[PDB]
Design an enzyme around this catalytic site. Structure first.
Site, PDB file in Angstrom:
ATOM      1  N   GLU A  32       2.259   1.783  -3.524  1.00  0.00           N
ATOM      2  CA  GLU A  32       1.261   2.278  -4.465  1.00  0.00           C
ATOM      3  C   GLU A  32       1.087   3.784  -4.337  1.00  0.00           C
ATOM      4  O   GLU A  32       0.934   4.487  -5.342  1.00  0.00           O
ATOM      5  CB  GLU A  32      -0.062   1.559  -4.223  1.00  0.00           C
ATOM      6  CG  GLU A  32      -1.194   1.997  -5.118  1.00  0.00           C
ATOM      7  CD  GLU A  32      -2.293   2.697  -4.354  1.00  0.00           C
ATOM      8  OE1 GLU A  32      -2.954   2.042  -3.525  1.00  0.00           O
ATOM      9  OE2 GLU A  32      -2.496   3.905  -4.576  1.00  0.00           O
TER      10      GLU A  32
ATOM     11  N   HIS B 285       0.825  -1.200   0.000  1.00  0.00           N
ATOM     12  CA  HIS B 285       0.000   0.000   0.000  1.00  0.00           C
ATOM     13  C   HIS B 285       0.862   1.254   0.000  1.00  0.00           C
ATOM     14  O   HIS B 285       0.563   2.224  -0.704  1.00  0.00           O
ATOM     15  CB  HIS B 285      -0.925  -0.034   1.208  1.00  0.00           C
ATOM     16  CG  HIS B 285      -1.820   1.155   1.325  1.00  0.00           C
ATOM     17  ND1 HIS B 285      -2.817   1.432   0.417  1.00  0.00           N
ATOM     18  CD2 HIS B 285      -1.878   2.131   2.259  1.00  0.00           C
ATOM     19  CE1 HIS B 285      -3.447   2.532   0.783  1.00  0.00           C
ATOM     20  NE2 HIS B 285      -2.897   2.976   1.898  1.00  0.00           N
TER      21      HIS B 285
END
Ligand code: CDL
Ligand code: CDL
Ligand code: CDL
Ligand code: CDL
Ligand code: CDL
Ligand code: UQ8
Ligand code: HEM
Ligand code: HEM
Lengths: 176, 95, 454, 354, 326
Positions: free
Chosen positions: C63, C60
C-alpha cells in the site's frame, strides 16, 4: 405474560389524562351540602373555638419572635433542603442581617434574657425569603423531573457512597 | 505497608476509602513487565497438580531428610528412658 | 416497547446506488450527488488476515509503495499529474479490507480512474522505493513511536484471536518487515488484487454508464479471479489478559476490555451498534453542553460522581465486526488510582443492559446513533466509504430508510434479550498499558458480568 | 461498616505463594465462634449447682443435647491443636522477627485461652476437676489469704464454681475483641511470605484465598466430625466421669492433654515455686527471641535444626506428663528442661565476628 | 514510618563493619558508572550438566563465631567510630560511608580534590565479577515449565461454565442443608425435655374406683379431680340441665362429661384458686371453704363468689377403664 398486559394498561391510562387540569385550577362550586355545613358549623366554630385558639397561638408566636428579636423567616432550619438551596442564593445584605439577628437570638435565649422593649416594635412576619424559596423550589423541581424520574441502579458501597442515591461520602452508618 | 518509594503514587486521583489497604501494598515496578493469563473456564484445572506431583514430593522429602539425624537421636533417647524405667521398677520392686 | 416509526419522507429522497457486475466479476457502484467534487476508488477484499504468518506485513508495504511510480509513469510524473488535476490519491489497508481512492474535481473523475488502474495493475515496485519505505516502516513499527490507542487496538486482537490470522497486525512483525522484497509484493498483488474482490465506487456528478464503460476499458486485463479462500472454523475467542505494566510512562493508564461480538451480517449487528451508542463516549476535556454530573448516559453520570473527582478521563465504546466474528467492548484512559472504579463502572454499565435498561436511554441512543451515521454521509468521501465498506460487508448498501426501519424494531427488550444471550456471564479479554496496579485479575473482572441483585 | 468489610475482605491483598500453613489462623477464628455459640446454648440447660448432673441431663433429656456436649468438649481440643500448630508455624518461619506486634497480640490471646480452658474443665465437676483445681490453687498458698478470697471458702465448693463460671462466660468474649487487634496488625503490618523478601505477586482475598481457606477448613471438618461422633482419639480422660469425693484422690491427677506440657514442668522441678517460675519462663521467653540480634537477617529458611529440636522437646515433655512420677522419668525430664534452656539461649544470643 | 527500631549501637563484643567486613572485600572501581560492564551483554560462566560441577562460591562459611544459631550474612547495624580504619582501595577493598568521609583514602596526589572525591561515589564500586554472575531473568517461567500455553483446552471443547456453577452450587446446596439441620436442632432443644413430656401424661386406671369416690391426680401442677358419679349424682346434674340459662355460666352436663359415670375436672376454684373439697356444699358437689363457693355434681358454680364453672381438662378415654390426661 401478565406484565406486558399491565404495562399496556398503564400506558393507555396515562395517555388518557395528559394535559388534565389540576384539581386546584378547576373553578369548583361547593355542593348544596357543604354550603349548609359552612353556613352553620364554620361560623360558630370560628367564633368559639378556632378563632380564639389560633389567635392565642399566633399572638404568642409573634411575642416569642419579638423577644428574640428575630423574624419568622429566620426561624427556618437549614437541615431542610429547600431552605439550604434558597440560602445559597440570597444576597449578601440580606445574609448579613439574618446572621446577626439569629446570633443575638441564641445569645438571648441561652442566657435566659429578652430583647429590650425599645427594640421590639417591628412586624416579624415580613416574608423576606419568599423570592428565594420559590426560586429554589423551581430549581429542585427541574432536577427532580429531568434527572430523577427512575430508580437508578449503581454499583453498591463504592467510593464512600452506598450507591443507593446519596451523594456525600461517609454520610451513613454503613459507609462510616 | 511497603516502603515509601514503593507506595508513592503517580496519579492524583484520591485513594478510595475501600481500597486503603490495597494501595498500601503497591510496588514501583522497575523496567516494566508483560503479564499474560487465560480464564480458568478455558483451561485444564487439575492437570498442573498431576504434572507437578513427583517433583513436589521429591523436593519436600529431601528437605525433610535434614531432620533425620536429630529425630533418630531423640528416638534413641526415647528408647533408653523407656527401658531405664523398666529396669528401675523391677530392681526396686520385683523379687 | 414499540413507540412508532421514525422513517420520514426525506429519508426516501436520496439518489439510488447503482451496482452492476462487470463480466470479469468487478462490481461497479455509483451514487449521483449534486456536488462539484467526486470520490472514485477501488475497495478490495484483502488485508492482513489473508496473509500468512511469514508474509505478514506485505500488504501494508505494498500500500505504501503502490503510488511511488508505475511502469508507465514515474513518482514525479504521477505526483505532478494528480496535482495538475487538483486531486489527491489516498489509500489504506486493514485486517479485512483495503481501499485506493482519489478525491477529485468533476473533470478529473475519468482521468483518476486511469491513474488508479495503472497503480493497481502495473505497479513499478522499485527497489530504491522499497528500501526507503523499509526505513520508514521500521521506525513506525517501534512501540515508542506508536500511540497508546494504536497499541491497545492491536493487542486486543492479539489476545482475543491467538489461534487465527485476525490476531496478526497490519504492519507486521519487525522480522518480516526486514525481509519483504519485491517478489513478496508481486505475489500478493497477483493472489489478492483480483476482479472478483474489487468494487469500483464513484460518488459525485457521475453517470453510471460512463463509469462502467471506463472501468471495463481500464480494468480489462485484471486477473478475473483467484482460488476460493480456505474454509475455516469460527475464529475462537480466547479470554485472556495481555497487560503491559509500566510505571515509567506517567500517570495515565490505558485499558481495553473486550467481549465476543457478532459478524457483519448477523441479525444482531444493529443491536450491537445501538448498545455501542448507549455506552457512548466521554472526555473530561470535551464535556459538551451537558456536564457529566447531569448526563443522560448512566455510565457517564455515575462515573463523574466518584470521589467528587470523576473516574473517567476518557472512555469510548467499540464495536468491531469481521466476516465471521466481532469484538464489542470499551476503551478507558484514566488516572492510575481510578482504574478499579473505572473498569468496575463501565462493566456494571454493560451488565445493566441484561437487567435494567430504560426506554429513555435507548431512545436517546437511537437518535445519537442516527445523527452520527447520517452526518457521516455528508461528503462524497463519506458516501464512498459507506458504499464500498457496505458492499464488501453485505454485498449491498443498506439505505438510510432501511437502517431506520430495522432500528425502529429494536427496543429495550430486544437489547436485553441479545445482551442476556451473548454478554451476560460472558468471557472477557483485558488488555492494558501503563501504571496498572489497580487492575485486578481477569477472573475478578469476569465476575462483574452478572449481578447478585435481580 | 460495609466499607470496612470491603477493605479487609474484598480488596485485601495477600501474596500468592503462601502455603496451607497460612490457613490455620482462619480455622482458629471459625472454631472460636463455634465454641462461643455452643457454650451459650449449653448454658440454656446447664445446672451450675451440680455440674455432674447437668451434663447427664443434657446428654439424655435434651433433644440433640449430646451434640452440644460433645462439640463443646471436642472443639476445645481442636482450638488448642490449631492454636499450637499456629504457634509452631510462627516459630518455624520466624514471623516474630519483624511482625512482633502481631506476635504480642497473639500471645495475649494465648494467655487468655489458658485461663478459659482450665476453668471450663473445672465446670465439669468430676473427680479430676475438683482435684485439679485443688492442686493448682495450692501453688499460690504462699500469698496470705489469697486462696480464701479466690475459693470463697476453705475448700473448693459450688461457691467457687459460681464465680469461675462468670469468668468462663465473659473472658472468651474479651478474647474475640483481641482477635480484632490481631487482625488490625496483620492487615497493617503485611503478612510474611514463604520467601524472606517482599515481592509483587499479591491477589485479592475473597476470590482466591477464601476459597482455599474454605477447602482447608472443610478438610479439617471431615476429621472433626469423625472424632465428634465416634471418638477415634481419646482426648478426654475418663476419670472425670467419677463423682467427686473430697476424701479420696483419684488414680492420677492430670489436666487435659493440652496442659500436659506445663503439668510435667511442675511435677519435675523439686521446689514448687521453681516449677511455677519455669512455667512462666517458657511462655515469656519466646517473646524476645529476636530482640538481641544485630545482623541484617531474619534467620529464615536455614535448616531450622534448633526449631525441630524444640518441637520434639514439647512432644517429649507432654509424653512424660502422662507417665507416673517414676524417678527415672524425673531425671530424663530434667535433662529435657536443661536442653530446652540451651536451645532458647541459641535463639537469643547474637553472633560475634571471626 | 511506623514505630520502628534499628540496632545501631556500640557492641561490647562484636566489631563494626569498617573494622571487619563480613563480605568478600574485592570490588572494582570506575570513574563513571557508565564504565561498568553491562551484565546483559556480558558472557556468564559455561553451563554445567551436573550439580557437582557447579562453581565455587566466594562466601566464607565461618565468617561469624560464638554461641548462637548459625547465620551467613554480609551486613550488620553496628555504629562506626569517628576515626574508621583506612580501607585499602589499592587492593580492591570497598570504600563507602565513614571510611570515605572520615578518612583520606580518596586523596590522590595531584588530582583536583573535586575530581578525587568524585571517583569514590558509591556508584563507582561494583563487586568483582558482578557482570559474569548476577542472573538476568528474561521470564518468570523458565523453559520446560507448564503455563497457559500448555493447559489451554482444545478449541473444539465443550462449555465449562455449566459444570463450574454446578460445583459451586453443590457447595451451597450442602452448606444450606447443614445450616438448616443445625438451626432446627438447636430450636428443637427448647421443646419440653424427655423427662418433662413424660411427666405431663398421667393415665387414670378407672379400675378399683367405686361409685361416688373422688380422687385427685396432680397433672401439670394442678389438682385434677376424677370422680365416679352415682346415678343420683348423674340425675342431679341432668335435672339442672333443664334449668340451664338460670346459671351464672350456662353449661350442660353432656358438654362437660364424655361418659356420664365419670367427671374429670380441674379442682381449682374459679374465684381465687383455692382447691374445693368434694361432698360439701348445698348441692353435695364441691364446696370451696375459702369464700363459700358451691359447685354442683357437674362442677358448675351454683352459689358463692366464684364467677365461672370448674374447667374440664383435656383428657380422652383409652379404653373403658383408663383415661389419658393430655
Ligand atoms: C376487580 C376487577 C376484576 C378483577 C379480576 C381479577 C383478574 C385476575 C384473576 C385471574 C387470574 C388468571 C391467571 C391465569 C394464569 C394462566 C396460567 C397459564 O396458562 O400459564 C401461563 C402463565 C404465564 O406464562 P408466560 O406467558 O411464559 O409468562 C411467565 C410469567 O409467569 C408471567 O408472569 P408475569 O411476568 O406477569 O409476572 C407475574 C407473575 C408472578 O406474580 C406473582 O407471583 C405476584 C407476586 C406478588 C407478591 C406476593 C407476595 C405474597 C402475598 C401473600 C398474601 C397472602 C394473603 C392471605 C390472606 C388470608 C386471609 C384472607 O404472575 C404469574 O405467574 C401469574 C399467576 C397465574 C395464576 C397461578 C398462580 C396464582 C397464585 C397461586 C397461589 C396459591 C397459594 C396456595 C396456598 C395454600 C395454603 C395451604 O404461566 C405461569 O407463569 C403461571 C404460573 C406461575 C406460578 C404459580 C405457582 C405454580 C406452582 C406450581 C407447583 C408445582 C409443584 C410440583 C410438585 C412436584 C413434586 C414431585
Ligand atoms: C395473611 C398472609 C399475608 C402475607 C403477606 C406477605 C407480604 C410480603 C411482603 C414482602 C415485603 C414487601 C415490602 C414492600 C415495601 C414497599 C415500600 C415502598 O413503597 O417503597 C418505595 C420506596 C421509594 O421511596 P421514594 O421516596 O419514592 O424514593 C426513595 C429515595 O428517597 C429516592 O429514590 P431513588 O429511586 O431516587 O433512589 C435510587 C435508589 C433508591 O434506593 C433506595 O431507596 C434504597 C434505600 C436503602 C436500602 C438499604 C437500607 C439499609 C439496610 C437496612 C437493613 C439493615 C439490616 C439488614 C440485615 C440484618 C441481619 C440481622 O434506587 C435504587 O437503587 C433502585 C434499585 C433498588 C434495588 C437494589 C437491589 C440491591 C440492594 C438490595 C436491597 C434493596 C432491595 C429493594 C428494597 C426492598 C424493600 C423491602 O423504596 C423503598 O422503600 C426502598 C427500599 C427500602 C427498604 C428496604 C427494606 C429491606 C427489608 C428490611 C426488613 C423488613 C422487615 C419488616 C417486615 C417486612 C415485610 C413487609
Ligand atoms: C399487628 C401486629 C404488628 C406487629 C409489629 C411488628 C412488625 C414486624 C416488623 C418490625 C421490624 C421492622 C424492621 C424495619 C426494617 C427497616 C430497614 C431499613 O430501612 O433500614 C434502613 C433505614 C435507614 O433509612 P435510610 O437512611 O433512608 O437508608 C439509606 C441508607 O443507605 C441506610 O443505611 P444507614 O447505614 O444509614 O442505616 C442502616 C441502619 C439499619 O439498621 C437499623 O436502623 C436497624 C434495623 C433492624 C432493626 C432490628 C430488627 C430486630 C428484629 C429481629 C430479631 C428478632 C428476634 C426474635 C427471636 C425470638 C426468640 C424467642 O443501621 C444499620 O444498618 C446498623 C447495623 C448495626 C449492626 C451491628 C452488629 C454488631 C457488630 C457486627 C457483628 C458482631 C461483631 C463480630 C463478632 C464476631 C465473633 C468472633 O432504617 C431506618 O431508618 C429504620 C430503623 C428502624 C426503626 C424502627 C422500626 C419500627 C417498625 C414498625 C413496627 C414496630 C412495632 C413495635 C415493635 C416493638 C418491639 C418490642
Ligand atoms: C541466694 C540467691 C540470691 C539471688 C539474687 C539474684 C538477684 C539478681 C538481680 C537481677 C536484677 C535484674 C537484672 C536484669 C537486667 C536487664 C538488662 C536488660 O534488659 O538489658 C537489655 C539490653 C538491651 O541492649 P541493646 O543495646 O538494645 O541490645 C544489645 C545487643 O543485643 C548486643 O549487645 P552487645 O553485642 O554489646 O553484647 C552485650 C552482652 C552483654 O552480656 C552480658 O554481660 C550478660 C552476661 C550474662 C551471663 C550469665 C551467665 C550465667 C551463668 C551461670 C553459671 C553458674 C555456675 C554454677 C557453678 C556451680 C559449681 C558447684 O550481651 C550479649 O552478649 C547478649 C546478651 C543476651 C541476653 C539474654 C537474656 C536472657 C535472660 C534470661 C536468662 C535465663 C532464663 C532461662 C533459664 C531460667 C531457669 C534457670 O541488653 C544489654 O545491654 C545486654 C544485657 C544482657 C544481660 C543478661 C543478663 C543475664 C543474667 C543471667 C543470670 C543467671 C544466674 C544463674 C545463677 C546460677 C548459680 C548456680
Ligand atoms: C461461624 C462458623 C459456623 C457456625 C455454624 C453453626 C454452628 C453451631 C453449633 C452447632 C450446634 C449443634 C448442632 C450441629 C448439627 C450439625 C449436623 C447437621 O446439621 O446435620 C443436619 C443433617 C443431618 O440429617 P437429618 O437432619 O437427620 O436429616 C433430615 C432429613 O434428611 C430431611 O428432613 P425432614 O425429614 O425433617 O424433612 C423432609 C421433608 C421436608 O419437607 C419440606 O420441607 C417440603 C415441603 C416444602 C413446601 C414448600 C412450598 C413453598 C411454596 C408455598 C406456596 C407459595 C405461594 C405463593 C403465591 C403468591 C401469589 C401472589 O421433605 C420431604 O419429605 C421430601 C419430599 C418433598 C416433596 C415436596 C412436594 C411439594 C409439593 C407442592 C405442591 C403445591 C401445589 C399447589 C397447587 C394448588 C395451588 C392453589 O445433615 C444432612 O443430612 C446433610 C445433608 C447434606 C446434603 C446431602 C445431599 C448431597 C447431594 C450430592 C449430589 C452430588 C452427586 C450427584 C450424583 C450424580 C450421578 C450421575
Ligand atoms: C495440678 O495439675 C495441673 C493442671 O491440672 C489441674 C493444669 O492445668 C496446669 C496448667 C494450667 C494452666 C497453665 C492454667 C491454670 C489456669 C488457672 C489456674 C485459671 C484460674 C482463673 C483465673 C485466672 C480467672 C481470673 C481471670 C482473669 C484474671 C482474666 C484473665 C485474662 C487476662 C488477665 C488478660 C487480660 C485481662 C482481661 C481479659 C480482663 C478484662 C477486665 C475487664 C474487662 C474489667 C473491666 C472493669 C471495669 C471496671 C471497666 C498445671 C501446671 C498443673 O500442675
Ligand atoms: C475458647 C472458648 C471456650 C473453651 C476453650 C471452653 C472450654 C470448655 C471446657 C473444656 C469445658 C468442659 C468440657 C467437659 O465438660 O469435660 C467447658 C464447659 C462449659 N463451657 Fe466452655 N469454653 C469456652 C467458651 C465458653 C463460652 C463462651 C460459654 C458460655 C457463653 C461456655 C460455657 C460453658 C458451660 C456452661 C460449660 C459446662 C458444660 C460442660 O460440662 O461442658 N464456654 N468449656
Ligand atoms: C485466638 C488465637 C489466634 C487467632 C484467632 C489467630 C489468628 C490469626 C490469623 C487469621 C492470622 C493471619 C493469617 C495467618 O497467618 O494464618 C494470624 C497471623 C499471625 N499470628 Fe495469630 N492467631 C491466634 C493466635 C496467635 C498466637 C498465640 C500467636 C503468637 C504466639 C500468633 C502469632 C501470629 C503471627 C506472628 C502471625 C503473622 C503470620 C505471618 O506473618 O505470616 N497468633 N493469626
Amino acid at each position: 405474560s401478565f406484565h406486558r398486559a399491565f404495562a399496556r394498561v398503564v400506558c393507555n391510562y396515562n395517555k388518557s389524562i395528559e394535559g388534565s387540569v389540576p384539581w386546584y385550577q378547576v373553578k369548583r362550586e361547593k355542593s348544596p351540602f357543604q354550603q349548609v355545613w359552612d353556613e352553620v358549623f364554620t361560623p360558630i366554630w370560628f367564633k368559639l373555638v378556632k378563632g380564639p385558639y389560633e389567635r392565642w397561638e399566633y399572638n404568642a408566636l409573634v411575642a416569642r419572635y419579638r423577644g428574640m428579636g428575630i423574624m419568622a423567616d429566620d426561624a427556618m432550619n437549614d437541615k431542610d433542603m429547600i431552605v439550604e438551596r434558597a440560602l445559597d442564593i440570597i444576597p449578601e445584605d440580606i445574609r448579613i442581617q439574618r446572621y446577626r439577628r439569629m446570633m443575638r437570638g441564641a445569645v438571648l435565649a441561652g442566657r435566659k434574657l429578652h430583647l429590650p422593649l425599645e427594640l421590639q416594635n417591628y412586624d416579624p412576619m415580613v416574608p423576606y425569603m419568599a423570592p428565594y424559596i420559590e426560586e429554589a423550589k423551581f430549581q429542585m423541581q427541574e432536577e427532580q423531573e429531568l434527572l430523577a424520574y427512575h430508580p437508578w441502579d449503581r454499583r453498591l458501597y463504592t467510593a464512600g457512597v452506598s450507591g443507593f442515591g446519596e451523594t456525600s461520602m461517609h454520610s451513613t452508618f454503613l459507609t462510616m | 505497608p511497603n516502603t515509601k518509594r514503593d507506595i508513592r503514587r503517580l496519579g492524583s486521583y484520591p485513594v478510595p476509602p475501600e481500597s486503603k489497604n490495597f494501595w498500601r501494598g503497591r510496588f514501583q515496578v522497575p523496567g516494566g513487565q508483560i503479564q499474560q493469563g487465560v480464564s480458568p473456564m478455558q483451561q485444564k484445572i487439575f492437570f498442573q497438580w498431576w504434572w507437578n506431583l513427583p517433583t513436589r514430593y521429591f523436593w519436600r522429602f529431601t528437605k525433610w531428610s535434614d531432620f533425620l539425624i536429630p529425630s533418630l537421636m531423640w528416638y534413641t533417647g526415647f528408647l533408653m528412658c523407656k527401658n531405664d524405667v523398666e529396669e528401675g521398677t523391677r530392681s526396686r520392686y520385683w523379687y | 416497547y414499540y413507540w412508532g416509526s421514525t422513517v420520514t419522507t426525506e429519508m426516501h429522497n436520496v439518489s439510488p446506488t447503482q451496482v452492476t457486475r462487470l463480466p470479469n466479476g468487478m462490481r461497479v457502484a455509483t451514487q449521483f450527488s449534486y456536488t462539484d467534487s467526486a470520490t472514485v476508488g477501488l475497495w478490495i477484499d484483502a488485508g492482513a488476515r489473508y496473509e500468512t504468518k511469514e508474509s505478514n506485513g506485505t500488504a501494508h508495504f505494498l500500500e505504501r509503495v503502490l503510488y511511488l511510480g508505475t511502469k508507465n509513469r514515474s513518482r514525479d510524473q504521477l505526483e505532478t499529474e494528480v496535482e495538475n488535476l487538483g486531486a489527491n490519491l489516498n489509500s489504506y489497508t486493514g485486517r479485512e479490507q483495503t481501499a485506493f481512492y482519489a478525491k477529485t474535481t468533476k473533470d478529473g473523475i475519468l482521468p483518476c480512474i486511469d491513474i488508479l488502474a495503472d497503480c493497481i495493475l502495473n505497479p513499478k515496485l522499485d527497489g530504491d522505493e522499497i528500501e526507503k519505505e523499509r526505513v520508514r516502516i521500521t521506525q513506525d513499527l517501534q512501540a515508542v513511536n506508536q500511540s497508546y490507542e494504536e497499541l491497545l487496538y492491536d493487542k486486543v486482537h492479539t489476545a482475543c484471536y491467538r489461534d487465527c490470522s485476525l490476531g496478526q497486525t497490519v504492519i507486521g512483525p519487525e522480522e518480516n518487515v526486514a525481509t519483504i522484497k519485491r517478489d513478496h509484493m508481486v505475489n500478493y498483488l497477483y493472489n489478492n488484487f483480483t476482479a472478483d474482490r474489487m468494487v469500483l465506487v464513484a460518488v459525485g456528478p457521475v453517470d453510471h454508464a460512463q463509469i462502467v464503460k471506463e472501468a471495463e476499458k481500464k480494468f480489462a486485463n485484471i486477473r478475473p479471479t483467484a482460488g476460493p479462500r480456505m474454509l475455516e472454523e469460527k475464529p475462537y475467542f480466547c479470554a485472556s489478559e495481555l497487560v503491559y505494566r509500566n510505571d515509567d510512562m506517567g500517570p495515565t493508564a490505558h485499558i481495553a476490555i473486550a467481549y465476543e461480538g457478532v459478524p457483519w451480517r448477523s441479525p444482531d449487528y444493529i443491536t450491537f451498534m445501538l448498545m455501542n451508542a448507549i455506552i457512548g463516549s466521554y472526555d473530561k476535556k470535551n464535556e459538551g453542553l451537558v456536564p457529566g454530573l447531569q448526563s443522560a448516559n448512566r455510565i457517564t453520570q455515575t462515573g463523574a460522581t466518584r470521589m467528587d473527582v470523576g473516574c473517567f478521563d476518557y472512555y469510548t465504546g467499540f464495536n468491531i465486526a469481521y466476516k465471521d466474528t466481532g469484538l464489542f467492548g470499551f476503551y478507558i484512559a484514566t488516572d492510575e488510582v481510578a482504574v478499579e472504579h473505572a473498569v468496575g463502572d463501565l462493566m456494571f454499565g454493560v451488565t445493566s443492559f441484561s437487567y435494567s435498561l430504560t426506554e429513555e436511554e435507548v431512545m436517546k441512543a437511537k437518535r445519537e446513533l442516527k445523527t452520527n451515521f447520517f452526518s457521516g454521509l455528508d461528503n462524497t468521501t463519506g458516501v464512498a466509504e459507506d458504499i464500498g465498506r457496505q458492499i464488501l460487508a453485505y454485498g449491498r448498501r443498506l439505505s438510510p430508510a432501511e437502517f431506520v426501519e430495522r432500528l425502529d424494531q429494536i427496543d429495550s427488550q430486544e437489547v436485553q434479550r441479545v445482551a442476556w444471550n451473548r454478554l451476560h456471564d460472558a468471557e472477557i479479554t483485558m488488555t492494558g498499558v501503563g501504571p496498572l496496579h489497580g487492575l485486578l485479575q481477569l477472573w475478578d473482572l469476569r465476575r462483574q458480568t452478572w449481578w447478585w441483585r435481580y | 461498616f460495609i466499607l470496612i468489610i470491603k477493605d479487609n475482605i474484598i480488596l485485601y491483598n495477600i501474596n500468592d505463594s503462601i502455603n496451607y500453613l497460612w490457613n490455620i489462623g482462619y480455622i482458629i477464628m471459625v472454631v472460636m465462634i463455634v465454641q462461643v455459640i455452643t457454650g451459650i446454648i449449653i448454658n440454656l440447660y446447664m445446672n451450675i449447682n451440680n455440674g455432674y448432673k447437668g451434663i447427664i441431663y443434657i446428654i439424655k433429656e435434651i433433644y440433640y443435647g449430646y451434640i452440644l456436649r460433645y462439640i463443646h468438649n471436642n472443639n476445645s481440643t481442636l482450638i488448642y491443636v490449631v492454636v499450637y500448630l499456629h504457634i509452631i508455624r510462627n516459630l518455624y518461619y520466624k514471623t516474630y522477627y519483624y511482625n512482633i506486634l502481631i506476635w504480642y497480640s497473639g500471645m495475649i490471646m494465648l494467655y487468655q485461652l489458658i485461663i478459659i480452658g482450665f476453668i471450663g474443665y473445672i465446670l465439669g465437676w468430676g473427680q479430676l476437676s475438683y482435684w485439679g483445681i485443688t492442686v493448682i490453687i495450692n501453688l499460690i498458698s504462699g500469698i496470705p489469704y489469697l486462696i480464701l478470697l479466690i475459693s470463697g471458702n476453705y475448700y473448693i465448693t459450688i461457691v467457687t464454681i459460681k464465680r469461675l463460671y462468670i469468668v468462663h462466660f465473659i473472658l472468651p468474649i474479651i478474647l474475640i475483641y483481641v482477635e480484632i487487634i490481631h487482625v488490625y496488625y496483620i492487615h497493617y503490618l503485611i503478612n510474611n511470605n514463604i520467601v524472606e523478601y517482599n515481592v509483587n505477586n499479591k491477589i485479592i482475598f475473597n476470590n482466591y484465598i477464601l476459597v482455599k481457606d474454605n477447602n482447608g477448613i472443610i478438610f479439617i471438618l471431615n476429621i472433626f466430625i469423625l472424632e465428634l461422633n465416634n471418638n477415634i482419639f481419646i482426648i478426654a480422660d475418663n476419670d472425670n466421669l467419677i463423682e467427686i469425693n473430697i476424701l479420696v484422690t483419684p488414680i492420677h491427677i492430670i489436666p487435659e492433654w493440652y496442659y500436659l506440657y506445663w503439668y510435667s514442668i511442675l511435677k519435675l522441678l523439686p521446689n514448687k515455686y521453681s516449677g511455677l517460675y519455669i512455667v512462666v519462663n517458657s511462655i515469656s521467653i519466646i517473646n524476645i527471641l529476636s530482640e538481641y540480634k544485630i545482623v541484617i537477617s531474619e534467620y529464615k529458611n536455614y535448616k531450622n535444626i534448633i526449631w525441630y529440636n524444640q518441637i520434639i522437646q514439647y512432644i517429649s515433655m507432654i509424653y512424660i506428663g502422662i507417665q507416673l512420677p517414676i524417678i527415672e522419668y524425673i531425671n530424663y525430664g530434667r535433662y529435657i528442661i536443661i536442653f530446652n534452656i540451651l536451645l532458647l539461649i541459641m535463639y537469643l544470643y547474637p553472633k560475634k565476628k571471626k | 514510618h511506623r514505630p520502628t527500631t534499628v540496632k545501631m549501637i556500640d557492641s561490647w563484643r562484636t566489631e563494626p563493619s569498617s573494622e571487619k567486613p563480613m563480605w568478600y572485600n574485592r570490588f572494582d572501581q570506575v570513574d563513571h558508572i557508565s564504565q561498568h560492564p553491562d551484565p546483559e551483554k556480558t558472557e556468564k560462566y559455561p553451563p554445567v550438566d551436573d550439580t557437582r560441577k557447579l562453581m565455587k562460591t566466594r562466601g566464607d562459611p565461618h565468617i561469624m563465631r560464638g554461641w548462637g544459631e548459625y547465620v551467613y550474612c554480609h551486613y550488620e547495624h553496628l555504629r562506626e567510630p569517628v576515626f574508621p580504619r583506612k580501607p585499602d582501595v589499592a587492593k580492591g577493598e570497598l570504600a563507602a560511608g565513614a571510611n570515605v568521609t572520615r578518612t583520606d583514602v580518596w586523596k590522590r596526589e595531584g588530582e583536583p580534590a573535586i575530581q578525587s572525591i568524585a571517583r569514590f561515589n558509591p556508584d563507582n564500586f561494583r563487586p568483582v565479577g558482578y557482570a559474569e554472575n548476577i542472573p538476568c531473568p528474561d521470564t518468570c517461567v523458565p523453559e520446560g515449565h507448564l503455563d497457559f500455553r500448555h493447559t489451554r483446552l482444545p478449541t473444539w471443547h465443550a462449555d465449562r461454565r455449566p459444570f463450574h456453577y454446578f460445583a459451586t452450587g453443590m457447595f451451597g446446596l450442602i452448606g444450606l442443608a447443614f445450616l438448616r439441620g443445625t438451626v432446627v436442632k438447636v430450636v428443637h432443644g427448647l421443646w419440653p425435655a424427655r423427662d418433662a413430656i413424660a411427666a405431663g401424661v398421667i393415665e387414670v386406671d378407672l379400675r378399683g374406683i367405686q361409685p361416688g369416690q373422688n380422687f385427685v391426680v396432680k397433672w401439670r401442677g394442678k389438682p385434677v379431680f376424677v370422680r365416679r358419679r352415682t346415678q343420683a349424682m348423674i340425675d342431679a346434674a341432668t335435672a339442672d340441665d333443664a334449668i340451664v340459662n338460670s346459671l351464672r355460666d350456662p353449661e350442660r352436663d353432656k358438654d362437660r362429661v364424655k361418659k356420664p359415670e365419670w367427671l374429670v375436672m380441674l379442682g381449682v376454684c374459679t374465684h381465687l384458686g383455692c382447691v374445693p373439697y368434694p361432698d360439701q356444699g348445698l348441692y353435695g358437689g364441691y364446696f370451696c371453704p375459702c369464700h363459700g363457693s358451691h359447685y354442683d355434681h357437674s362442677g358448675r358454680i351454683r352459689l358463692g363468689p366464684a364467677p365461672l364453672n370448674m374447667e374440664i381438662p383435656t383428657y380422652e378415654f383409652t379404653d373403658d377403664d383408663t383415661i389419658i390426661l393430655g
